[PDB]
Amino acid sequence: MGRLYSGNLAAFKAATNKLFQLDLAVIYDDWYDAYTRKDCIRLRIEDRSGNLIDTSTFYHHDEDVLFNMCTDWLNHMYDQLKDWK
């Protein structure tokens, strides 16, 4: 929907350039919830047509550790899909 701007996002923004070059898509869900109304960080990976790739939900200690975990896993798949076709 949109993109935020903050200091911890300095390194985070850099990762985006890789996503296009590996031919994949990623969407995150935040600020929307059912009846519980609780803060959470949901990260979802998928294709263009329908094949779903993977998903992860993060809740833990403050933003520094949270973003570290998020950026870590994103870098994780890069090499793996770089080996296959």
Side-chain angles (χ1 to χ4, degrees), residues 15-83:
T16 316
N17 182 30
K18 291 295 184 300
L19 299 176
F20 186 84
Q21 297 300 329
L22 186 60
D23 191 58
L24 50 71
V26 50
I27 57 173
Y28 66 97
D29 181 65
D30 159 67
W31 184 251
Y32 297 88
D33 183 75
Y35 175 76
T36 49
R37 290 176 58 109
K38 189 85 294 189
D39 297 289
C40 53
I41 300 295
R42 306 177 189 182
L43 189 66
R44 184 181 297 164
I45 307 294
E46 62 180 88
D47 184 71
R48 71 272 281 161
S49 187
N51 290 336
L52 64 162
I53 302 300
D54 206 282
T55 189
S56 190
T57 305
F58 295 93
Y59 73 96
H60 194 244
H61 201 244
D62 300 287
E63 69 299 290
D64 177 80
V65 68
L66 205 300
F67 286 112
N68 172 269
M69 298 182 294
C70 302
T71 183
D72 174 66
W73 190 80
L74 281 171
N75 183 271
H76 148 80
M77 63 172 60
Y78 288 144
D79 179 81
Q80 297 299 271
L81 299 177
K82 284 175 176 292
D83 183 276

Side-chain angles (χ1 to χ4, degrees), residues 5-12:
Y5 298 85
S6 54
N8 306 90
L9 294 181
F12 186 89

